């Protein structure tokens, strides 16, 4: 069940902002084909999650002056019917056009009709240009759209940056869902660290990938889910009941040890035997009601003194970033440059080893590519209500005591409160204390 008051406020917000996006689009057009679980964070899908809290496959949504048009099946139109009355009073009329797959002539007429309304709004049409969906609905739609662009002289422009700004600031309910997600990540991290220690202690034959898979699979263990429920349900926003079915993975858990450390988002657990010495990097990111979170911990197994000392600096760095650097009003570039400067002042020798970013805005997407915390983004300001995956590390560090280089990585989900007087709030709280992440065999 969909909160239509939320649907109404979010669609009205988008409607009020879009003509002021870059390029001044006269209309917006969002076409969703079949859902793909392996590619869940495209802008059109994000829009559906934001507006409705569910992805509606084989559905078109258009915004033009005065109207929101939804082309979808009878079943789906029935889920959305109650929304219509909300716009009866508003610049928007809501219109639900129902498809019928035994009437392909009607289905074509609907598509021609919406393109006519788009044409009437103006020549500039805003779409998320990187989005790609497959399936039967898209096979119908694609040639109709392509003909319209070519025949009507549509100027089709990207709106990803505009969308990113519209839904950037998290409302109080969204903040709650992010908190729930993050607590989930904490509890899986706790499991992960326990299973990892057991693996080393019991001399298990197990690869990094197999161990991370074990943790991933616990999301389907209803016994484990039951255990999770008290702590997660306490964090749900007022009037929203905790629901198991809304728990998912943002991405596959990762464990790294031994020969290979990769600090980029593209990293995946290797098929190498779990290496029970030195640095073990682990990352879990649970998703609750579409709200992504992330946590990365480094575990130290019989660490040399230099690994331990560099781990201490890693903690100090995170405290400096979150307490002093990551402030409303600042650009990602300014934040990242400030980080480099701090490292340059304290441990200059480690600058070449540092990650190229310190994470990104997080929310309905795991990583908003228009708000990565690196030097390339000089065009966004941090705002109160923003939530971040603050993730950084040092790779290719030299161990005098081992044949393997080592790495250190730390990530937490951090909320910037809406209230001016409140500091950044860690949503992920699983320990990072050196004595609690160090193990000796």
Cα(31)–Cα(25) distance, integer angstroms: 17
Contact 321, 339 (CB under 8 A): yes
What's the first-to-final CA gap in the chain, in angstroms? Answer: 52
Resolution in angstroms for this experimental structure? Answer: 1.7
3-state secondary structure (DSSP) of residue 406: strand
**Rounded to the nearest 10 degrees, how much is the dihedral formed by the CA atoms of 116, 128, 167, 42?**
130
Strand order in the sheet with 291-292: 247-249, 286-288, 291-292
Contacts of 245 (CB under 8 A, 6+ apart): none
Other beta carbons less than 10 A from residue 272's beta carbon: 14
- Tokens representing 434? 């050196």
Helix (H, G, I), strand (E, B) or coil at 263: coil
Residue keyed to tokens 């500039």: 124
Alpha-helix runs per DSSP H in 25-103: 43-52, 74-84
CB atoms under 10 Å from CB of 332, counted, come to 25
Q: Classify burial at 275, counting beta carbons within 10 Å of its beta carbon; exposed 0-12, middle 13-18, buried 19 or more.
A: middle
Domains of the chain: 1-167 (3.40.350.10), 168-441 (3.90.230.10)
For residue 321, is it left (φ>0), alpha (ψ between -120 and 50) or beta? alpha
DSSP assignment of 296-363 equals EEEEEES--HHHHHHHHHHHHHHHHIIIII--TT--HHHHHHHHHHHHHHH-GGGGGGB-S--EEE-S
Residue 158 to residues 21, 27, 131: CA-CA distances in angstroms? 9, 12, 10
Instruction: Looking at 97-207, list the stretches that DSSP marks H as alpha helix, in order from N- to C-terminal side.
Output: 104-121, 136-152, 160-166, 172-201
Identify whether the C-beta of residue 199 lies closer than 8 Å to the C-beta of residue 308.
Answer: no
For residue 350, count CB atoms less than 10 angstroms from its CB and return exposed for 0-12, middle for 13-18, buried for 19 or more. Answer: middle
Q: Which of 237, 33, 216 is nearest to 140 (CA)?
A: 33
Whole-angstrom distance, CA of residue 159 vs CA of residue 42 = 12
């Amino acid at each position: 069940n969909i909160d239509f008051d939320v649907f109404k406020k979010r669609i009205e917000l988008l409607y009020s902002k879009y003509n002021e996006f870059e390029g001044s689009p006269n209309s917006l057009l969002f076409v969703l084909g079949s859902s793909n679980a392996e590619n869940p964070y495209q802008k059109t899908t994000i829009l559906h999650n934001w507006l409705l809290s569910y992805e509606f496959p084989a559905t078109l949504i258009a915004l033009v002056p005065g109207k929101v048009i939804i082309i979808t099946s009878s079943a789906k139109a029935k889920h959305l019917q109650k929304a219509i009355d909300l716009f009866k009073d508003s610049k928007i009329t809501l219109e639900l056009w129902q498809r019928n797959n035994k009437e392909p002539e009607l289905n074509k007429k609907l598509f021609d009709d919406v393109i006519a309304l788009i044409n009437s709004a103006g020549k500039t049409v805003g779409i998320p240009e990187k989005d790609s969906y497959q399936g039967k609905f898209m096979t119908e739609w694609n040639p109709v759209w392509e003909a319209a662009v070519k025949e009507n002289e549509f100027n089709v422009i990207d709106i990803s940056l505009g969308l990113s700004k519209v839904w950037e600031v998290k409302d109080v309910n969204e903040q709650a869902f992010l908190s729930v997600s993050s607590k989930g990540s904490d509890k899986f991290m706790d499991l992960l660290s326990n299973e990892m220690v057991r693996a080393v202690d019991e001399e298990l034959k197990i690869t990094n990938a197999k161990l991370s898979d074990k943790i991933e699979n616990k999301i389907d263990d209803v016994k484990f889910l039951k255990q999770l429920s008290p702590d997660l349900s306490a964090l749900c926003p007022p009037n929203y009941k905790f629901n198991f079915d809304l728990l998912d993975w943002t991405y596959s858990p990762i464990i790294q040890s031994g020969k290979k450390f990769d600090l980029r988002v593209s990293a995946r657990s290797t098929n190498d035997q779990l290496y029970g010495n030195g640095c073990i990097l682990a990352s879990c990111g649970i998703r609750y009601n579409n709200y992504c979170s992330n946590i990365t911990r480094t575990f130290l197994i019989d660490p040399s003194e230099e690994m331990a000392n560099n781990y201490d600096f890693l903690l100090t760095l995170q405290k400096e970033i979150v307490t002093n650097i990551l402030k409303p009003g600042r650009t990602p570039k300014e934040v990242y440059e400030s980080v480099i400067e701090y490292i340059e002042k304290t441990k200059p020798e480690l600058v070449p080893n540092f990650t190229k970013n310190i994470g990104s805005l997080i929310g309905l997407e795991f990583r908003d590519s228009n708000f990565i915390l690196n030097v390339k983004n000089d065009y966004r300001k941090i705002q109160r209500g923003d939530c971040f995956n603050i993730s950084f590390g040092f790779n290719n560090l030299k161990d005098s005591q081992s044949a393997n280089n080592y790495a250190l990585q730390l990530a937490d989900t951090v909320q910037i409160p809406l209230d001016e007087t409140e500091p950044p709030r860690f949503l992920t709280n699983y320990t990072k204390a050196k004595s609690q992440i160090s193990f000796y065999f």
